[PDB]
Amino acid sequence: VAFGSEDIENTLAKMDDGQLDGLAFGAIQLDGDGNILQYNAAEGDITGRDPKQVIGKNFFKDVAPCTDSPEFYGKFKEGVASGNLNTMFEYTFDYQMTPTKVKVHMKKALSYWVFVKRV
Ligand SMILES: *C(=O)/C=C/c1ccc(O)cc1
C-alpha cells in the first residue's frame, strides 16, 4: 500500500500488527479524543518513540505537543466532527527528536489514521 492511496483505509482495515509494521510509512491510529490505538514500527523509526509504550497515551497532549495547533490538531478535530476526515499537509516534528520535515495524511478509519512520511 502506498502513502496517500485513495483507498488506504480499506487496505489497512484488513491488517495485523506485523502487517502494519511492514508499511513503508508511519501509521498511527487515534480515537476521537486523540488517544493512541495503534502505532507502527515505521513511525517509531522516524520519531524515536517505542511503539509498544505509546499505546494508550494522548497524541496531542503528551506524545506530540508540536502537533497541538490549528494546522494539525485543529484539522483533526474538524474532521472528527464532520465525519469526513481525509486531509494532507506538510509539517515539522521536533519534540524529543531531531527536527524532521514530514508529509501527513489524516483519514477516518472504517478511529482515525495519521500517516507520516519523510520529505
Ligand atoms: C511534535 O511534537 C511531534 C512529535 C511527534 C510526532 C509524531 C509521532 O509519532 C510522535 C511524536
From Swiss-Prot:
Disulfide bonds: none annotated. One of its GO terms (molecular function) is photoreceptor activity. The modification S-(4-hydroxycinnamyl)cysteine is found at C66. Keywords: Chromophore, Photoreceptor protein, Receptor, Sensory transduction. Residues 20-83 form the PAS domain. Belongs to the photoactive yellow protein family. NCBIfam families: photo_yellow. Photoactive blue light protein. Probably functions as a photoreceptor for a negative phototaxis response. This is Photoactive yellow protein. The lineage of its organism: Bacteria, Pseudomonadati, Pseudomonadota, Gammaproteobacteria, Chromatiales.
